Ligand binder design. Structure first.
Ligand code: FES
Length: 98
């Protein structure tokens, strides 16, 4: 009936986790529902510093101020964990790294 999902998210800052979440994957919602409590940053789509990365999974990620900057070249640059869609996320790196 429902589709199960597994989010593997490791921060290049040095954190690494593999949780379970169905229907609504969302690395924040799933690990907020499992036991941990993460948080991207401002979620305003205007910093361009949180250059996160996406290993695999068809999940979605859309900037917030697209009318200031298109997220294409920024997507082909890397991925942003400020939006994070729960469509299908298999493995993702966090927005921090160093
Ligand atoms: S747009 Fe502000 S840290 Fe992501």
């Amino acid at each position: 009936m429902q589709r199960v999902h597994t989010i593997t998210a490791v921060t290049e800052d040095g954190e690494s986790l593999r949780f379970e979440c169905r229907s609504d994957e969302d690395v924040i919602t799933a690990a907020l529902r499992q036991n941990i409590f993460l948080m991207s940053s401002c979620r305003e789509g205007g910093c361009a510093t949180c250059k996160a990365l996406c290993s695999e999974g068809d999940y979605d990620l859309k900037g917030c101020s697209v009318q200031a900057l298109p997220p294409e070249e920024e997507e082909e640059g890397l991925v942003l964990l400020c939006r994070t869609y729960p469509k299908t996320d298999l493995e993702i790196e966090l927005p921090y790294t160093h």
